[PDB]
Amino acid sequence: GAIQQELKAIQQELKAIQWELKAIQQELKG
Amino acid sequence: GAIQQELKAIQQELKAIQWELKAIQQELKG
Amino acid sequence: GAIQQELKAIQQELKAIQWELKAIQQELKG
Amino acid sequence: GAIQQELKAIQQELKAIQWELKAIQQELKG
């Protein structure tokens, strides 16, 4: 059952990474 | 179930990140 | 084994992401 | 146990990705 929470933590970290990549692209593209 | 739902979400986030990386590389090259 | 195999697939994608980030770094550094 | 070992490895790769992003962000600042 605890696997769900470990996996969710991975997904949350990846979501934050995606926003950092969007910030980089906005600096280049904006 | 809950585990499979998180694995799906992780895989979706990975695809989104890879899309952003491709877009950044395109912007930097061109 | 099913969950382990999905985690190995995730690890493979994370490796690809790292190589793309290293390419972006070299684009900017050089 | 094997699943937990794969999760540990994923965390190692996520930390590496975070540091690659830090290097890119710093390049963009100068």
CA dist., res. A8 & res. B24, Å (int) = 26
Technique employed here was X-ray
Q: Residue C29: its chain D contacts at CB < 8 A?
A: 27
DSSP label at residue B30: -
Q: Which residue has the tokens 């912007």?
A: B27
Resolution in angstroms comes to: 1.1
The tokens describing D15, both together, are 């930390």
How many domains is chain D partitioned into structurally? 1
CA dist., res. A10 & res. A15, Å (int) = 9
Going from the C-alpha of C10 to that of each of A7, A14, A30, the distances in angstroms are: 11, 11, 32
What is the CA B23 to chain-centroid distance, rounded? Answer: 12
CA dist., res. B25 & res. C6, Å (int) = 28
Q: Is D9 on the interface with C (CB under 8 A)?
A: yes
Angle subtended at Cα C19 by Cα C22 and Cα A16, rounded to the nearest 5 degrees: 80
- Minimal-distance CA residue of chain D relative to C26: D24
State the residue range of the domain holding B23. 1-30
CA dist., res. A10 & res. B7, Å (int) = 10
Alpha helices in chain B (DSSP H): 2-29
- Residues found in chain D: 30
Q: How many beta carbons lie within 10 A of that of residue C12, not counting itself?
A: 11
CA dist., res. C4 & res. A29, Å (int) = 39
Contact B30, A30 (CB under 8 A): no
Which residues lie below 8 Å from residue A3, measured CB to CB, with a gap of 6+?
A: B3, B6, C3, D3
Contact A13, B13 (CB under 8 A): no
The tokens describing C14, both together, are 């994370």
